[PDB]
């Protein structure tokens, strides 16, 4: 059960965390067997406000159905068992290109495979069970763009500290800045 859940040969952190799951695995019936069916493709490491680098886990995305059933209990043991670390769960999506003129016909394209829909599921994954209740985009008089992503209410505690990591996490993926806010 060591490198099985890895779904790929490399590397080190992918092993450590893959080891970490199996240390959370044998707790017997409800703390395993619902955590075993899940898997992950890869892990990337990038910096955070808390000085604690971020650990971003990719998911094949049939599988975000069960991971979402766990999540909060899991990312509590992952940020504990692997600490000085911020642990988030992203889902690997396809991003098909917008065909050019000179390009020759490919199979059509769904809209959930589109670069913009994808980055709008990224922001949906980085945040979790709170919600996204609204958005805005300021175009600064410099010509810069900054996305105001507004969050919800209850349970929001869980990402409270995680705010400035998502902005960084998303800026290593995209090239666009993020900020958040809450009601009044």
């Amino acid at each position: 059960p060591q490198a099985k859940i890895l779904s790929q040969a490399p590397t080190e952190l992918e092993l450590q965390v893959a080891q970490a799951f199996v240390e959370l695995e044998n707790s017997s019936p409800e703390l395993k067997a619902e955590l075993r069916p899940l898997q992950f493709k890869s892990i990337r490491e990038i910096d955070v406000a808390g000085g604690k680098k971020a650990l971003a886990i990719f998911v094949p995305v049939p599988s975000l159905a069960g991971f979402h059933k766990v999540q909060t209990k899991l990312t509590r043991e992952l940020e504990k068992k692997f600490q000085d670390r911020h642990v988030i769960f992203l889902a690997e999506r396809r991003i098909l290109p917008k065909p050019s003129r000179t390009s020759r016909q490919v199979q059509k394209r769904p809209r959930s495979r589109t670069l913009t829909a994808v980055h709008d599921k990224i922001l949906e994954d980085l945040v979790f069970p709170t919600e996204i209740v609204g958005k805005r985009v300021r175009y600064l008089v410099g010509g810069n763009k900054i996305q105001k992503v507004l969050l919800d209410s209850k349970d929001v505690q869980q990402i409270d500290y995680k705010l400035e990591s998502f902005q960084a996490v998303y800026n290593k993926l995209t090239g666009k800045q993020i900020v958040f806010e809450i009601p009044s």
Partner: protein, 62 residues
Amino acid sequence: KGNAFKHKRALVEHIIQAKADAQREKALNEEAEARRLKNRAARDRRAQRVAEKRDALLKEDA
């Protein structure tokens, strides 16, 4: 009883060609209903092996 049948020979040739377009209508509605029904197997079979390998790469790693 209206016109459009100039004699026996035409009336027959009409009937000749009317049963021929009622077969091309039957054969195409049997064969493309064989295309639909028999691709419903390739959906239940390919949805089975992700439900059969769903308990198989679960149980066998125990």
